[PDB]
Design a protein around this ligand. Structure first.
Ligand code: PMP
Ligand code: PMP
Ligand code: CL
Ligand code: CL
Lengths: 425, 425
């Protein structure tokens, strides 16, 4: 009953094929079925296509929009900051207030460095772990996504998963299965003091959603501590979504370097690296680890981020978002439970994902066994119901403050009905 | 007669020492004398400190603000775009119009990919040159700045100029002197078909300002063409500053991959890579060279960039900016010419820099011979005159549209008077 990609979108779609590689500026955007819809504007829980169709947004730009689109509070803060100019080339005030608030939640007494993307952030964290330890090796886990830079575009043979990445760079990155304590202990017994740092997502969000095993978390902290390797918690997604204290507070764990992003920018380009004074002091202009950026601590990003965190402390964002995701899971379960089809749903607060054909998903290997065809059809049916979920089973479904009342009702009805349609396909 | 860093700035300065490494979020910001001033807001040609002092901005965030601060046209475009939401997670309309306009000026019939910083942009261009050719080596020039990523944090022994950068990565980058035809031809005769690409700034902006020799430019195009290596013109600064067609149109040259940034974002986080369909088609989701980004083609950046380019085509920005820089050069020359002090001033349109103690600066080595102490004192005196120039002699002085009338008068008077003071110091 809804046509997300209409004739206006069709025109733009054929038109951008000549302007951008693959027709888009980011891979995941091209997978939308039957073809990408173009957005005219966004507000609250909705995206509005150039043709006019209104769509409930369960993607939220893949994490940043926990407050929904064009949040009134953040909008007003940004409007006010805008009247003061948006770029200075020197220190501003908002960056100071945001740093203090962020550090108060993720690394009290530590320091922070603001960058412009999660990619720049994890890239900076890695260079920092190498500079601090004097080691080269970085350990990452299969299924974890850390951005668009050489060091993390690697898989176990360490070989490049993208072209243009020298074999020499790829060899310096190790890879083992997520949640695999056995393998984790083995790789450390195999490389020991040559490992500079261990980067990991406390909760995987780029291979569907996958919660961590308590033993995996404990092993990570213990092994990095005993070997001298820095534990890098990539909280670009988990930061400020799993509560104000993020993954560290949620799972009661500690990281040496905390990578932040998306939510802390209020919807504007952002990335950040936080750590103790001992580690952070290595960054230029204080130490030898280089990091610079024309847009670092961009005034508008700072202002939007501060307002966003302010809203997270004053509004029932976490409860509302948790309830929305819970309601979606219950709706999907109510329909699927009336079948003989195996499946599983992983959910951590406001982030979740459905996996068809398997009863358990505790790692990327299992996540990859899920029925892709079923999911893709589900994605398409949902759009036809006016609901937008990631076009890929390996992405995640995110809920936010606006997912309540009518918007939630539409999403829930859409999910029930889309499942039934796909089930009877 | 002006105190840029007052008591409000002093408080913030001591306060941020505990929040950020070196007290700032980007190295160059810490060099401001006697210590960094904090900005409350910016408008037109001015920056306003938290204490209140108004300062003429000859830094302009180091390039992006060719239209000055809070340009009315760009402001209104951004306000309107803001009301439509600032982040979608799917394609928007502004990105399409900006891509078409940019490509029409720098690579007709080609493609483009929007990223979030110049660093991400040059990093993407390099990975693209390596993926396209299947080669590893990248040639850069001494004094050129390409961002905060491993591959370009290198110098000739290729060794790392920053900590945390593996020797293996650094060895894959070659470095020779800027404008040195002899050395350029030699390195190609030494590495030949192993070179994936040659990255260079058509006009150096991060070792003072240094124009290119016509022979250097010709050799670059010829050698890359004959060896199969891609010529990567880093126009993050030159793009849209040296005319709408940038360096290519200004010097009548051609690059395989054009790196863009700063101005194309209208003051918001941005970066871009442009090239022919043959090369660009390698980027994901079309090809194997990976590049993704949550904020790629950010709606506000797109809207601000489009409005900015629109202003560049409709307003006398280039003539006004050229005249301002010319007036500053004449004022500095009028004072210095009445002395027996050797010096030289390099200027290309709206970008320039003064070099004391040397009669010529055609490369970074010479630029490094300039009197740093004189410059630093000049920087401080200027601030005391209410004018802001880079605190480092290796940075550049940029002029923009607002540099006219009273603002220009203040800058010119400040320069004359600051020179005299330093000369009599
Ligand atoms: C030529 C060039 N390339 C890359 C960069 C880095 O741009 P960004 O700081 O946005 O990463 C700069 C900024 N100094 C630059 O001038
Ligand atoms: C955990 C994680 N790290 C890094 C990134 C990349 O962030 P960005 O796209 O802004 O570079 C993402 C975004 N998918 C992420 O989820
Ligand atoms: Cl929005
Ligand atoms: Cl501004």
């Amino acid at each position: 009953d809804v046509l997300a990609s209409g004739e206006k979108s069709r025109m733009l779609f054929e038109r951008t094929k000549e302007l951008f590689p693959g027709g888009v500026n980011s891979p995941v955007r091209a997978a939308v079925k039957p073809y990408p819809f173009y957005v005219k504007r966004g507000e609250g829980a909705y995206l509005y296509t150039v043709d006019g169709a209104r769509i409930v947004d369960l993607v939220l730009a893949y994490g940043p929009l926990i407050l929904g689109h064009k949040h009134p509070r953040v909008l007003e803060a940004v409007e006010e900051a805008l009247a003061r100019g948006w770029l200075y080339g020197a220190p501003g005030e908002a960056e100071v207030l945001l740093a203090e608030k962020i550090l108060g939640y993720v690394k009290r007494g530590g320091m922070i460095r603001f960058v412009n993307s999660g990619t720049e952030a994890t890239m900076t964290a890695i260079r920092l772990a190498r500079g601090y330890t004097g080691r080269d090796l970085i350990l990452k886990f299969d299924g974890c996504y850390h951005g668009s830079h050489d060091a993390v575009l690697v898989a176990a043979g360490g070989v490049p998963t993208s072209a243009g990445v020298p074999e020499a760079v790829a060899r310096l990155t190790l890879v083992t299965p997520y949640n695999d304590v056995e393998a984790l202990e083995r790789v450390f017994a195999e490389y020991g003091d040559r490992i500079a740092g261990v980067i990991v997502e406390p909760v995987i969000a780029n291979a569907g959603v996958i919660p961590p095993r308590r033993e995996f978390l404990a092993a990570l902290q213990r092994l990095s501590r005993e070997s001298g390797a820095l534990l890098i918690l990539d909280e670009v997604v988990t930061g400020f979504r799993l509560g104000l204290e993020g993954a560290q507070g949620y799972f009661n764990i500690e990281g040496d370097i905390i990578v932040l992003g998306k939510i802390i920018g209020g919807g504007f380009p952002v990335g950040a690296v936080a750590g103790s004074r001992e580690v952070m002091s290595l960054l230029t202009p204080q130490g030898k680890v280089f990091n610079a950026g024309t847009f670092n601590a961009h005034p508008i990003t700072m202002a939007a981020g501060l307002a966003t965190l302010k809203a997270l402390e004053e509004e029932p964002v976490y409860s509302v978002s948790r309830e929305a995701a819970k309601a979606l899971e219950e709706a999907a379960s109510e329909v699927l439970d009336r079948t003989g089809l195996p499946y599983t749903i992983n959910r951590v607060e406001s982030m979740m994902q459905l996996f068809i054909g398997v009863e358990e998903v505790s790692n990327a290997a299992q996540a990859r066994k899920a029925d892709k065809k079923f999911y893709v059809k589900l994605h398409e049916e949902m759009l036809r119901r006016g609901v937008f979920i990631a076009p890929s089973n390996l992405e995640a479904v995110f809920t936010g403050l606006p997912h309540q009342g009518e918007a939630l009702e539409i999403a829930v009805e859409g999910l029930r009905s889309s499942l039934k349609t796909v089930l009877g396909s």
